Amino acid sequence: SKLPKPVQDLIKMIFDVESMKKAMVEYEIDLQKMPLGKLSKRQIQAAYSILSEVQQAVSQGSSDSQILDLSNRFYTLIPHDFGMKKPPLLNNADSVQAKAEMLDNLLDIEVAYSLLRGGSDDSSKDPIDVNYEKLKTDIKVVDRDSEEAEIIRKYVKNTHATTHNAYDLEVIDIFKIEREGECQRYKPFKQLHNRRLLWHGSRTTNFAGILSQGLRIAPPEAPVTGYMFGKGIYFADMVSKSANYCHTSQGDPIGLILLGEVALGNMYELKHASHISKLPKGKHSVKGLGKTTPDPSANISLDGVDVPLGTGISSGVNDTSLLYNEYIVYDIAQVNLKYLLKLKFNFK
Numbered sequence: 215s216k217l218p219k220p221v222q223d224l225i226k227m228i229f230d231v232e233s234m235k236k237a238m239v240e241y242e243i244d245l246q247k248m249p250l251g252k253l254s255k256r257q258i259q260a261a262y263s264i265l266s267e268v269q270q271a272v273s274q275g276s277s278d279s280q281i282l283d284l285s286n287r288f289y290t291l292i293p294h295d296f297g298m299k300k301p302p303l304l305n306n307a308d309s310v311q312a313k314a315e316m317l318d319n320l321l322d323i324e325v326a327y328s329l330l331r332g333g334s335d336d337s338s339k340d341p342i343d344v345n346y347e348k349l350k351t352d353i354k355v356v357d358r359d360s361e362e363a364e365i366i367r368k369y370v371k372n373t374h375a376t377t378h379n380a381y382d383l384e385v386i387d388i389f390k391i392e393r394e395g396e397c398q399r400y401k402p403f404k405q406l407h408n409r410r411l412l413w414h415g416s417r418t419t420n421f422a423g424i425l426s427q428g429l430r431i432a433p434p435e436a437p438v439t440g441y442m443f444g445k446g447i448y449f450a451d452m453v454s455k456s457a458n459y460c461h462t463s464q465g466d467p468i469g470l471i472l473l474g475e476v477a478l479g480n481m482y483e484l485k486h487a488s489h490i491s492k493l494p495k496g497k498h499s500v501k502g503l504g505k506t507t508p509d510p511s512a513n514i515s516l517d518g519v520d521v522p523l524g525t526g527i528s529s530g531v532n533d534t535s536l537l538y539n540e541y542i543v544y545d546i547a548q549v550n551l552k553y554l555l556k557l558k559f560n561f562k
């Protein structure tokens with residue numbers, strides 16, 4: 215391939231088939247009953263629906279048995295291997311949240327698989343360059359000794375704390391990204407002040423879907439438990455908050471994290487969970503107020519884009535149920551993915 219090494223390694227990383235199966239098994243999924251090639255979008259939608267019905271049964275206080283049929287229905291759809299004692303009973307918000315979390319991931323793994331299988335699996339062109347196209351994203355390496363790299367690295371350093379210091383962060387590679395399409399889609403939302411460069415972390419297995427389809431908002435069938443401010447796109451201004459969603463471990467200490475410019479507009483500020491969806495007039499985003507915040511004085515700029523790389527400090531309010539700030543947008547078009555980082559997590 216004509217691609218740089220780092221990009222070639224990035225490509226292999228996100229289209230890793232073993233990583234997909236590892237994610238499943240991790241979930242207790244029986245690969246013999248539900249192999250990769252058997253994953254279906256329709257089946258996941260149906261699974262989402264069952265999950266929502268459970269939430270309702272849980273909130274109403276269904277006279278059980280019904281909760282048992284719901285549970286049986288979900289495990290019949292998504293075949294898990296437990297061995298004995300029987301599968302857990304989805305009888306609480308905590309249960310559905312976990313199962314829903316798994317469905318989102320399976321969905322992206324399915325997207326990655328079908329993408330990696332579609333097209334001409336021919337050896338005319340090298341597999342790397344072929345899979346690189348399926349992403350429909352332009353990826354370039356950002357040099358270590360560039361102002362870009364310097365800014366980004368500082369953002370990572372400053373926004374990384376200690377009370378969340380189970381690990382340290384090492385930036386291995388920085389990529390500038392431009393999804394084919396997302397550029398004319400965001401142009402209009404540019405006429406929206408308050409534009410910020412925020413973090414978005416996710417599992418490595420979700421990256422083919424993300425770069426290929428962009429950041430998405432959960433579908434209607436999906437239960438809403440687990441979304442403090444409703445179904446939207448979540449971001450942080452402190453890499454510590456985002457890095458928790460990369461789900462890395464001493465086993466696989468490397469993760470991927472995005473930096474996106476989001477046209478926030480006027481922010482509706484809240485300190486506790488609230489299922490918005492319909493923003494108040496004049497507001498174009500939600501901001502969840504946390505106890506920690508990057509030093510406002512250290513904020514920097516770039517073509518109207520605010521980069522809050524100031525070191526973490528205590529914010530005004532502490533009467534919040536949030537340790538960190540979060541920003542939520544309800545329109546995919548308010549997002550412009552700009553950078554992708556390959557990070558190594560060094561646990562203590």
Ligand SMILES: NC(=O)c1cccc2nc(-c3ccc([C@@H]4CCCCN4)cc3F)[nH]c12
Pocket residue numbers: 311312314315318413414415416439440441442448449450455456457459540541
């Ligand atoms: N990803 C980031 O960088 C990120 C950054 C800041 C806040 C964030 N909040 C989330 C989030 C993730 C998953 C879900 C729900 C949980 C229930 C099952 C369906 N997914 C809900 C969320 F609100 N991500 C955040």
